[model samples]
Target chain A: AGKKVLIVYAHQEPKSFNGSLKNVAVDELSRQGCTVTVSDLYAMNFEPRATDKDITGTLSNPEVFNYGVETHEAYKQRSLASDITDEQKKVREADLVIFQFPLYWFSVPAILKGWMDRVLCQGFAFDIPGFYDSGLLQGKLALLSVTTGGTAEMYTKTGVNGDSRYFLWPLQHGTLHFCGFKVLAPQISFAPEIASEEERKGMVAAWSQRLQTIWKEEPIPCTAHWHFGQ
Target chain B: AGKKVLIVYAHQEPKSFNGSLKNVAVDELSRQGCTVTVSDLYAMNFEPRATDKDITGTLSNPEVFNYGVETHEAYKQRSLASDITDEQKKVREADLVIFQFPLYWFSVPAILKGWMDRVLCQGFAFDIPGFYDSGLLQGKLALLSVTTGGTAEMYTKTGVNGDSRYFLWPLQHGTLHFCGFKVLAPQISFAPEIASEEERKGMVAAWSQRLQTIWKEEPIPCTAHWHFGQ
Candidate 1:
């Protein structure tokens, strides 16, 4: 009865809605006897830029810095910065990974995006001819618990923002599914800043209720049609 | 014949393919007598995270932190970070804005994405009622010049990556269009690492050739049909 969950949270304020959702996850998961860890990126002052400094040793190819190639080799040689390696270790041990953040420009915050870019290196999360169905982290599951500034009505097909699934393709199918992780349906809490206090509490409580049955949930199909209709 | 262009570039290496494209844009555009300003994000080491530091002065709401709300007020109060303000000034003056970067997980590098998040705040880029067709940056033109590690064949409808356009919906439609930047068809230089030296140079030269006649081109319709074929 031991399951490990890692929540990579990217928010500056500890008392914000994003923070409340994160705290609820830790509480519910811990109450269920599951091991939970939260990587508060802002609290850690995580370095968001993917640079040569990420590698502590000589680059695999110093002349032309190709991040994907250099960092993949560094991961294999154990030359990556301790910070990146530490996150990778958390990823490796977790059965489920939850990314909690406020949607910026219709996607994850840059800090969280940086974590995906750096930590999910070719060798660790994927490799050529071995991505998607045959990816490195095939057994693990990933979910996006996002809060948006826009309301649900605004994200519909007829709405000004179009279908919300249209925005999920790049993150869910391209990144998460490509890495071989089974993707759970996203839990999007819309317009928390505009919502009443009771509404915000309801959203938080809804998440806590869902975690009670999270293990029994099946991953989405994660096909192209699933994100963008035919 | 006189125009202003702002190229927001995000690659660490000065000699990388992304750099080459950015450099050629500058050289060609300058030769054409257009004033060009390149915000080399990696060279600038631009801050990618949105924190309280973004608002230099007192908090709009000390008890609760809402980035969208606080940043909007900060922009109106003239208390936003100088770095963000500087970028906004460039955007305000530029006739065309080009984003140059290597694609990470089928999207922009985190640094450039952060630039969009921070620089294009509610008041600067759009307001609640003045988005999409009526957005603040309506007359500005924006294009994405992206390089990818994957080859062209890998991004097709039948390929492992599905259609590349599937990944472009969020950036092209959700962000750029929503902010009222007239979208141009992207310049995607595929698989530069796999290309021969001659091919790489050809790619760079092609970009220079394109820039010479860029002003004569019209913006894409940026419709749902354009992104997702029926």
Candidate 2:
């Protein structure tokens, strides 16, 4: 297969559950003769702050700095910073993009969030009339393989956490779907930190097996009804 | 009428719409005989990444690192990073905390998100038995005054962006309410970048007027039904 997969990983420890999932995805994909690229965000110390520095050349308005406006202009002029451009290149080459990270406050970590904010610019990932179903990256596929501290029960609708899907609306729909990517239902490895070695191994194996047929999996509805309920 | 307000602002431009809202809040709160302290993240260059560096001293487990576990240990041992500790102190002292930022992909900017992930640790913000209604910071009040690139129409129930309330569930219920902060209805200034001068001023004036009796307002239900609808 000539398909390319990019795992934008955001974990500090190499031995963590998130790390294992990332490694397995790379291994299984490579074994299948599909090219894989891992953007180890923590290792790379990816810059999360979206400031004036993101633009390489002259700002669209040097008088008053606007991150979104400036970045959109820079992207059009091919003047975005090298780091952002490099990540975009990978995204462009990839058929599927996987965000591998532990949940921080029910969403991606700051570093990972920064990657989305900086790498996926207005002009690059989307525009006013060209978002959601008609986004620039519509042909691509995306998935969130996340690890959480809470147990399955705690994340239920009746539980204190209020349905895990409640949290996925922002990341899966607002961001990924907004960028026009077909989103796979998330791989939620709950409380892997407290799990026994056997359980952790099982989670990893499950992910590896899932990736074997990931290409065949259809994207979720990624809508209000799907995330919430009627 | 003496109160302490901490505004954790995360916008690069001082002249931007977010900055204006932040400034007005400070001035209005200060004029009302309240003590205000602003943690300007971009200007401060606050670190958003959660890694080994977050723990000031020796590693709790050098061989296999878990951010949540390590940070919890570090917090109890009084060895968390100074920046984290510093923000914690602000949270501790503040009667009301306002998070001011532009909506990046329907969530907070990375720098502000980093502040939450690092500062709100287990021992400091909440523990297993000490979360949600029984969280550590039970008495504090929190509000999210966010700016968006899209208009009100785009962020509706049937709009392309879904309801604006849909995105607030994670930040309001999961994060703030989980930490025992009474969540206020958010101040969403929709697409201020495209607004006329009169409209922008009205948004700022409206915020200033609201702060006049902000303490009188009640907290939201912060439930799935409240955010998602029946």
Candidate 3:
């Protein structure tokens, strides 16, 4: 069977380095007879705030409005907003999910973060007892194709910014691993805007090449040690 | 001299446990004759996406849009969105900044994260050669008053979630410390929704009591050792 890939892309310009990486992914994956879909967040003007409006129906408990609790109930009842449900459907159908974005303040851009918060609600992603090893979306695979403004040397263990892995814990361990996704080792393109045009193109080409053999790769051991180092 | 505090709060309902904590801060700070301002992100429906709209005037480089570069230029040209400017003004005037929210996916909620991404931008909060100890926001104090659905036991080193400090690295060290703000120890109220009404009130009371001596509280050593532990 052909593989299905969904790229949750968060970048404003279609001509930026991020855009090139995303476009190349689509090009290469499609050439391999894979079905590829890109959710260009900026073009979609995706709603970045998670509020009561996310649930289209009456709240299970309207009095206090606990977001996690309410959204969990909504997911169970199939009452979440169409936009959220649409993204969920894509996730449900995908064999692989790739998140492509530039690192902002040592984390994902807020728009992408909002997608995780709103889409991967309790019932949809995990239950209190059904997280980590027993998560709901157990079979799906996830990868973070990230770009940073700082050079690779700056993200080293003894560098000014500390180890880059220090910032990956929350995203890989707390979110993706918690939701039961097998996370691949991240593809980080460092300081693309600082790189020469040829270097930026090489970075994009490298990502596309990696995607060519993505299926043969193993998911990283998403433990604390893998991220923080012993 | 009066102290100024800025609380960047993200929650849907004002009656939720998060609201209680934020309200108590305002009350305690006001009682101490400190000027307090709250940026209720959800209430403000603050735009979380970093797009071209953030730069009100002509593009410094329209050929390609690099968010950090363009926004940094816009900031220098005084052409950033008025809302972003307004928030920047608040941050500039604040002696202390407190982030109040529920922990979403082991980090801050999307809205509050947006405030950090868009507000603590390149030129405003930091510069290439002037980050970390020499950041632009030096001398300002910052704190995270976070609530979580998980109990303290779930966040220990040997617990299900592998130490709460593991999650604090990006928020405390990478972002706040990177911007030169002295980060105080985080105030984490765990499982408030599961707590009894009396227990919830006690949590709020404890926060207010802490505010009484927040000025005298020393900032945490936001080093890798502090976050990862030996």
Candidate 4:
């Protein structure tokens, strides 16, 4: 109940369904005496492009810039740009991190993807040999509370959209689990825009109810077999 | 040999491995009499954030912003931003589209993702019920020429990173195939920064050789079984 939560949210409008979910998380989590911080990506105007500008001070190789090498070095040297370090600070302090956004191209929005790429650097999120289970951010809890443009029926194993889990492989297994976080089952609010207003409210209520006992939830098996059966 | 190709490239340094791949494609394809145009995302400072600013003039519903609904309406109304329109122009005329970038969190970089989110709106890339095999841009060919920080061995089915095909699902099956592009096998140049100069040279040489006969290549069966196994 005393845990710290950081929501890295990405959405253009505060009036959208994505906004509704984000607001509920803040409301419900704060009510339970948890410290909550939100990185409103669009309102913050977060720089999505990972460029040399991210590394302030002297570059490791000014002539031939390698993002992985340079950013890793910058993170260790505490020379990463102010904005990056700012987010990293939040991530470091977080006991649980929830990413709230509308799905784009069957994945996180570019702004959210930028947060994952830029904020979760080599030395910061996970090292080469130390990733997956033994990741640096181990014991941390992470979840993706996503709103999509498609319906549940469309994201079936036999549906035109494939299973929703198909898309979760990259975000849940690849990024979240790779970083050492225990990933909670995703909260997917499908086609909220097309849903009735009562249905949208029900989605929000369900998420709010889930957060009441989120601490008791078990992380999904972030594995190949879990995502893809033999 | 006479095809028009569009390379939507994302990577900061032009001297980086991703840049080298992009350069070789332009050179090799040009040598074969193919008209190649490159959208050097970083060079162009391509906007990655999908915002209300993307849609000019009056919104269909100005009270609340829905990126998908508004962008869809914008595309139909011919009121989308100039940058989006410019990229669409390139896509419309291209026989093949190759996205060159370092794998960012198991996917395309934010800039390239932004290109997809913005350029490939409803009515433009695919409309509802017309997606997947019947997508609007079905006739075009798209390839992902990705550079990765991880090694090839690590990206195998039994490896820590899971299969490279696993990561390819969202990009190839979800986005490319959804847009109706018969996808070409991706050119995965793994860990180029970690590779010796001679090895990097070999990787580039192999890619150059492949492009020499890329037209003769057939599309992969973009399906769940291909990525996830039976």
Alpha carbon lDDT at B92, candidate 2: 100
- Candidate 1 C-alpha lDDT tens digits along B23-139: 999999999889999998998999998888899879989887778788999999999999999999999999999999999988898888889889999998999879988889999
In CAPRI terms, model 4 is classed as high
Candidate maximizing DockQ? 2
- Name the runs in model 1 displaced over 4 angstroms: none
Q: Would candidate 1 be rated incorrect, acceptable, medium or high by CAPRI criteria?
A: medium
lDDT of 1 by residue, A1-230 (tens): 69999999999889989999999999999999999999999899888889888887788788988788889889889999999999999999999999999888888899999999989998999988779989898999999999988899988877778888888888998999899999999999998888998999999999999999999999999987887778
In candidate 2, which residue pairs clash? none
**DockQ-based ranking:** 2, 4, 3, 1
Top lDDT prediction, candidate number: 2
Model 2 alpha-carbon drift over 4 Å, by segment: none
Model 4, B1-230: lDDT tens per residue?
37899999898888878888999999999999999999999999999989999999789998988888899999989999999999999999999999998888889998889888989999999988789899999899999999998899999988888899998999999999999999998899998878998999999999999999999999888888888878
Q: What are the per-residue Cα lDDT tens digits for candidate 4 across A40-154?
A: 9999999999899999999988888888889999999999999999999999999999999888998988888888889999898999769888899999999999998889999
Single out the weakest 10-residue window by summed lDDT for candidate 1 chain B. B221-230
C-alpha positional error of residue A36 in candidate 3 after TM-score superposition, expressed in Å: 0.9
Q: What is the DockQ of the complex in model 4?
A: 0.83
lDDT on C-alpha atoms for all candidate structures? 0.90, 0.92, 0.91, 0.91
**What proportion of the real contacts between chains A and B does each prediction keep?**
0.68, 0.86, 0.82, 0.80
Question: How high a TM-score does candidate 4 get?
Answer: 0.98
Task: Give one clash count per candidate, in the order shown.
Answer: 0, 0, 0, 1
List the candidate 3 regions with Cα displacement exceeding 4 Å. none
